[PDB]
């Protein structure tokens, strides 16, 4: 299930950095940002293999990509938080 | 963020000279000079460990190694200046 929404300026500001580059399709800082979300445990609606893609939320001092990803899916302004590595997403909502 | 380019005239004469050294592989003034930054706030562009090296700027009348630095990437002409310790950097024009 989703976690219901969350405003988009309430978010880290890397957040809104990820999303600049999915509207621009990039460049995007990661070789694995695009690649399809599989959504293995069906945590967000299930769809067609390829409806999601994921891209990396940059997180300040961490050594690793860390675990904050935006999924997008195929629908307008259909993009999902998460910080906690696909353990739980959020809709955002980009008017807040 | 990189905040923007200067050219090189409009910095302190430091810069040059650390330039210079660079350029000649050293001999450098500070035993820190050429090791690697990490670019750990995530400030200048995602790269690979080691694609960024750190050396001083010289403050004038300074104890100590102070807050300037420049930044040397890989690329071809790209270095960047902080005089914040690593706060903030500009891109630094060569032609200028
Ligand atoms: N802030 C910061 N310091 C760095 C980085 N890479 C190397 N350093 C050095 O690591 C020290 C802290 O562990 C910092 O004081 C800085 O020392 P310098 O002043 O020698 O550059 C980096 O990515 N960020």
């Given at each position: 299930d989703v976690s219901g929404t969350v405003c988009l300026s309430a978010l880290p500001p890397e957040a809104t950095d990820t999303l600049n580059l999915i509207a621009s399709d990039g460049p995007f800082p990661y070789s694995q940002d695009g690649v399809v979300f599989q959504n293995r445990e069906s945590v967000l609606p299930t769809q067609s293999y390829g409806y999601y893609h994921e891209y990396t939320v940059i997180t300040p001092?961490?050594?690793?990509?860390?675990?904050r990803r935006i999924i997008t899916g195929?629908?307008?302004?259909?993009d999902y938080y998460t910080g906690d590595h696909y353990a739980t997403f959020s809709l955002i909502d980009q008017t807040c």
């Amino acid at each position: 299930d989703v976690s219901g929404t969350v405003c988009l300026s309430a978010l880290p500001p890397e957040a809104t950095d990820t999303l600049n580059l999915i509207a621009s399709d990039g460049p995007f800082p990661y070789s694995q940002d695009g690649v399809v979300f599989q959504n293995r445990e069906s945590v967000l609606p299930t769809q067609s293999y390829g409806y999601y893609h994921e891209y990396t939320v940059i997180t300040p001092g961490a050594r690793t990509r860390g675990t904050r990803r935006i999924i997008t899916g195929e629908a307008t302004q259909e993009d999902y938080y998460t910080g906690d590595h696909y353990a739980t997403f959020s809709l955002i909502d980009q008017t807040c």
